[PDB]
């Protein structure tokens, strides 16, 4: 009885579809969403949003960012920013982005802004490296 | 490790008895003369105004004008705890008349005001909300005993924290020598740490008594 909406700004995967379970890696810690979940709004962090569909088949999707919104009528709206599945990921590009981010962190020095962006890209690189190995 | 000492609460030390050890807040009273205040007067005014602004949400309509009495109680506790910890001034709260006058009559006034004005509130505050019929009598008896002994517990606590602090300070001082600089320095350092702990405990105790007084006046 869950109305799940997974909608990237370029692809719409689920449009108020009926979904058994939604796992979402957020800044509030990774949590699993079931029907009649609590109303809670969460801010997405990079990682695999794995969807347990009602037919018994589970499809995993990465998210770059976004927001998770659980509603009191048992309806979720995960509005990602980039989302393509774990099926299409290139491990070497993730490792190259991670190495570039670490180089930017080491060469930032006193630049607090470049250090912050390097830390963000380090988080995304670790998440992509972890996700592409499945 | 060697021994200790006691018998410091004597009220008959000399002809000029220890009742002058309670008037020392009058020396530390801030007496104001000029229009533009002095530094201690302005600091005291800032402290009291901050306390009034913090306790404004707990006053209530019944004791709107009684905040001055609560602030005087706070200053009374603070001066009897801070100046009571100085080494040659005896613990006034060791004799329980001070804590009796500090705690008991305001509770008697509040419980009489409750019993006269709102008897329904007096009979309903004992019974917890949502309590069924077979869970009544033990709750009634336990709450009656606890509420009839609660100001006594507050007074004995406000005496006993200072009693424990002064006993531990005297025990640390008595176990300190003079010929050994290491042992004396360790004793002095431990008394510094214990005195910081006792000063913080005294301030927190005065604050919690003020907050309890304001919240009970709100009732």
């Amino acid at each position: 009885q869950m109305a799940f909406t997974f909608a990237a700004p370029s692809q719409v995967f689920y449009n108020n579809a009926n979904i058994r379970q939604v796992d979402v890696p957020s800044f509030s810690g990774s949590f699993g969403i079931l029907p009649a979940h609590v109303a809670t709004l969460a801010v997405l962090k990079p990682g695999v949003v794995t969807v347990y569909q009602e037919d018994g088949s589970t499809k995993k999707y990465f998210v770059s960012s976004g927001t998770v919104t659980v509603n009191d009528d048992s309806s979720v709206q995960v509005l990602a920013e980039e989302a393509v599945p774990v099926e299409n990921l290139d491990l070497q590009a993730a490792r190259d982005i991670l190495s570039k981010a670490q180089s930017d962190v080491t060469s930032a020095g006193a630049d607090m802004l470049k250090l912050a962006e390097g830390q963000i890209a380090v988080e995304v690189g670790e998440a992509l490296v972890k996700a592409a190995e499945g | 490790m060697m021994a200790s000492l006691f018998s410091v609460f004597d009220p008959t030390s000399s002809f000029l008895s220890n009742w002058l050890s309670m008037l020392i807040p009058l020396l530390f009273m801030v007496m104001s003369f000029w229009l533009i205040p002095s530094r201690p007067q302005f600091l005291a005014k800032s402290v009291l105004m901050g306390l009034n602004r913090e306790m404004s949400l707990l006053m209530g309509p019944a004791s709107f004008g009684a905040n001055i009495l609560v602030i005087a109680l706070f200053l009374f506790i603070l001066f009897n705890n801070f100046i009571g910890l100085f080494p040659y001034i005896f613990t006034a709260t060791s004799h329980l008349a001070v804590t009796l006058s500090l705690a008991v009559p305001l509770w008697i006034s509040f419980i009489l005001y409750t019993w006269i004005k709102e008897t329904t509130n007096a009979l309903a505050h004992l019974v917890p909300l949502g309590t069924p019929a077979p869970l009544m009598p033990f709750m009634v008896l336990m709450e009656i005993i606890s509420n009839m002994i609660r100001p006594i517990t507050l007074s004995v606590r406000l005496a006993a924290n200072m009693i424990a602090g002064h006993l531990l300070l005297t025990l640390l001082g008595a176990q300190g020598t003079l010929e050994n600089l290491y042992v004396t320095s360790i004793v002095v350092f431990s008394q510094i740490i214990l005195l910081m702990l006792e000063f913080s405990v005294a301030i927190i105790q005065s604050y919690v008594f003020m907050t309890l007084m304001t919240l009970y006046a709100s009732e």
């Binding site: 393509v84 802004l113 992509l128 592409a132 | -």
Partner: protein, 37 residues
Amino acid sequence: SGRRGRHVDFGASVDFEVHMMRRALKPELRNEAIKRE
């Protein structure tokens, strides 16, 4: 985290996350995944 602490809002964090997420689609999908602006 360290994002907001360095006077960086969530829009810039979103932009960096989405750029690094688009860039991990080399052999077929970096061309058809980014419309640029």
